[PDB]
Design a protein around this nucleic acid. Structure first.
Lengths: 18, 90, 82, 108, 98, 92, 101, 98, 84
DNA sequence: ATCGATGTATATATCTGACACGTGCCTGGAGACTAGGGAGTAATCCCCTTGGCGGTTAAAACGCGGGGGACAGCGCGTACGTGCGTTTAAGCGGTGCTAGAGCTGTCTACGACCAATTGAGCGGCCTCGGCACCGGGATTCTGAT
DNA sequence: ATCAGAATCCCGGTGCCGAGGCCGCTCAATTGGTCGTAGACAGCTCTAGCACCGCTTAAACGCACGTACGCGCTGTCCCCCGCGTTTTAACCGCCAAGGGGATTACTCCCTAGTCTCCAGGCACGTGTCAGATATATACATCGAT
């Protein structure tokens, strides 16, 4: 599949490095 | 008219046993009509800025790269290019 | 006697709105203030929606006209569009 | 005198109707001329996006032990995954409860 | 005597999804503000329109409160004050807060 | 060639002010301001005529679009300014 | 001589061509470009009148874009209409919060 | 001895209208950000385009600082802190802050 | 000249200070500069990418001023003065 | 650190109305073919960008001192959550009415389409004055006293 | 209050280049007339919003209380801001090469358009099961001790 993987970064929104 | 049959088809393809409530079917039914609206509204003025009068597949690809952010672009631009070649193939 | 309609938005109702948002403690001055805010947000939508009914010949407010007014203002609503 | 009318959605391997979005692009007045392969691209990307939110809605409905997608599950699916969220940042889901947050204030 | 009952109240309300303002007084309010722009003549309202309007007002108010609570915690206090709601509308913009 | 709005901004400036002049950069500001306001009004009129299955941008649609766009008293004079132009235009 | 007939200054002919070529809708009624040029003429005349007062206050006979920024943001209605625009070479309005005394 | 020179500094800069960040390092920064998305090929820039980008960046930053300073006075202190800028971006919205 | 400064650090400390003085700010902390140079970069990272895609859709290679103002109008910040 | 009762989870049954599937009908999608023009492509030009050099020059960088500003603590007071009893209006359900959405049928006035005609608007060229800059002088605050 | 020292404001002078006016060209606006069809209008019908009534009851209101929390004050500590000196490098001016934007012409493939046929998708009906809900039981637990 290799579908997109949702991480949970500390930033609520995508500012840098996803 | 609506899009209710195709959401049910895609749902049975992704999950065999699940069902979708009527109100959630109306949610997806308005969602498709919004995303198609935003993509085609982008591709219209993209054709208009370059003095072109036709919407070719380059315009939908650049409008989806303008609208869908991040990895959701990079998959969907594959899914169009995987599809349209097959359409020319047959 | 009949109170003003705006005062029908109770302190239980505003508190139950604020508890959903995660607010822990509420001052007493909020209950007058947000009754104004809910007024102004309702003034902006209806003043579009009535206009969307006036342009058409229809003399009643359809559900489609409210979701069109909300998509015009930018906070688009799902569920009743289709 | 003709063959069996294989519809164009079948020959592209999709589920969304390419003829319907072709008629919607023509009557929509987006542009004077619509290309041939352009609605197929539109239908494939709509198919991929709806399959994405239906997959996340099913995964968010399984753990609640419910076998039927209600609009609360669509709110959880949309708000949990950020890449989708940015796209739908403006929209409000009807009957969608806010995702649970206590804003990190509790007694030790 | 039950201490910290606000936590159970919040954890119940965030899980629930039904509408929180009552239907009939919201309909009386919307019909009252409707008549000011119709230069005196009266309008009818569809039954779905009042539901859609109440959902919109509901979502916007719960977002305004959850944005003002960020400023309350930023100011080092816990109690929500109306100057913070006014500031959150003054920082969200001219057509996001108004 | 090239289309602009420079001469009409200049004419209405000479109409409302007798002798004040306008720099060419501010001419470009007004030349983009008109090209933006017109696009917002015609886009609102297009989707508004499309909502009611109408294929015509009629003067009713521009009236409802300018009432939906221009806020407050700017609407209340402009909808007065538009119809006064149309009633004179049918006087020909 | 369409403009003379309606007594306006913006040409209704060029906005008639812009309405048809713009592809907003399939047909264009006859009243629409007259109404459109009238409302554009009124909006332009109002913002240029406020800019002319702002240029007269600094005793300059030439409108620079700083004056257009001042005339836009001092008016409470055009600030709503032009809320999300930025004027190139336009300074911020002179505000201050904490008084010295 | 010249105290509170920030008052005359602010009153000078708010009166002025020219661009503030230097042109050549801003051009090198924008050409640095350009090369990462063109997968190796370089792009040219029209001379008006870099000025347009610098005007937009300066206007967005002065809006962000004027939104952050209201929060700085809201917390009862005077100096701008990066938690205020992060909060103003967290509260302006999804397309207003980024 | 002799040594090369960081390319990312193209915005000097007095420049950011002058921006905040234009913003009506009295006093600046020292930790702003390691973060505001972050929040500028992401802004350009949003704008420049969109402008490049516009230039990418045509066959052209150079970014013009029209493509930056189109990339800003689509994101929400209309820029007057160059478009047109 | 144990005990109680209050809440939470779970396990059972029960019932219901909304979902899903089946049928039948039909209008929109597909197939085949044409005619014409939008766009792809190649050739050419010259504008505009890049690039590199010298020489100034404001502006950045660096260091230092001091003060004023953030922050932690504490005490006072007060305003809001909680509990209890009392009271009200929201809500179900049910019934009746009709205004008005909505569909259909007709006909015409309006707007697209085209050919011929011409002047309003665009490009270039110029010329001069409004504004930028500067230098001397006049006044007016402002910190130091 | 008292002060000179900056600081600001104004004022005559120069200068330069960009605004504004003029000229010539040309293509896009205008005029006239025909064609068809979207929409105005009128009529008709059948849903759905409105009004009311009556009964229930859960929700709202008020009032007393207590205690957690805003907020004002103080004290210590530190981290920016101003200022002087040194050092960089942005900026201007210049020229030189060429890449690629922009234009023009040619041709052809693609797409609008029409006709003709039929099935995918609509509405309607109807059986059934997922889920809400009520009740019982098991288990964590938080406050008092």
């Amino acid at each position: 599949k290799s579908r997109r993987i949702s991480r949970r970064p500390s930033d609520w929104w995508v500012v840098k490095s996803e | 008219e609506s899009y209710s049959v195709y959401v049910y088809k895609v749902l049975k393809q992704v999950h065999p046993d699940t069902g979708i409530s009527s109100k959630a079917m109306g949610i997806m039914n308005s969602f498709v009509n919004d995303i198609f609206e935003r993509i085609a509204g982008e591709a219209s003025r993209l054709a208009h800025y370059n003095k072109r009068s036709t919407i070719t597949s380059r315009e939908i690809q650049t409008a989806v790269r303008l609208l869908l952010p991040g990895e959701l672009a990079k998959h969907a631009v594959s899914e169009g290019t995987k599809a349209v070649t097959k359409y020319t193939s047959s | 006697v009949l109170r003003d309609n705006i005062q029908g938005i109770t302190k239980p109702a505003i508190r139950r709105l604020a508890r959903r948002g995660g607010v822990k403690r509420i001052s007493g001055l909020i209950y007058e203030e947000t009754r104004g805010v809910l007024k102004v947000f309702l003034e902006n939508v209806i003043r579009d929606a009535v206009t969307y009914t006036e342009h058409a010949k229809r003399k009643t407010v359809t559900a489609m006209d409210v979701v069109y007014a909300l998509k015009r203002q930018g906070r688009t609503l799902y569920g009743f569009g289709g | 005198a003709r063959a069996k009318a294989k519809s164009r959605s079948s020959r592209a391997g999709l589920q969304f109707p390419v003829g319907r979005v072709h008629r919607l692009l023509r009557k929509g007045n987006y542009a004077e001329r619509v290309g041939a392969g352009a609605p197929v691209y539109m239908a494939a990307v709509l198919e991929y996006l709806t399959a994405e939110i239906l997959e996340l809605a099913g995964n968010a409905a399984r753990d609640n032990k419910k076998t039927r997608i209600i609009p609360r599950h669509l709110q959880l699916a949309i708000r949990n995954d950020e890449e989708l969220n940015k796209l739908l940042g403006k929209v409000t889901i009807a009957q969608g409860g806010v995702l649970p947050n206590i804003q990190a204030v509790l007694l030790p | 005597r039950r201490r910290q009952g606000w936590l159970k109240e919040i954890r119940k309300l965030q899980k629930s999804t039904h509408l929180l303002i009552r239907k009939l007084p919201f309909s009386r309010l919307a019909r009252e503000i409707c008549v000011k722009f119709t230069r005196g003549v009266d309008f009818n309202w569809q039954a779905q329109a009042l539901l859609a309007l109440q959902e919109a007002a509901e979502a916007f108010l719960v977002h305004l409160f959850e944005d003002a609570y960020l400023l309350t915690l930023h100011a080092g206090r816990v109690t929500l004050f109306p100057k913070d709601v006014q500031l959150a509308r003054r920082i969200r913009g001219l057509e996001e807060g108004l």
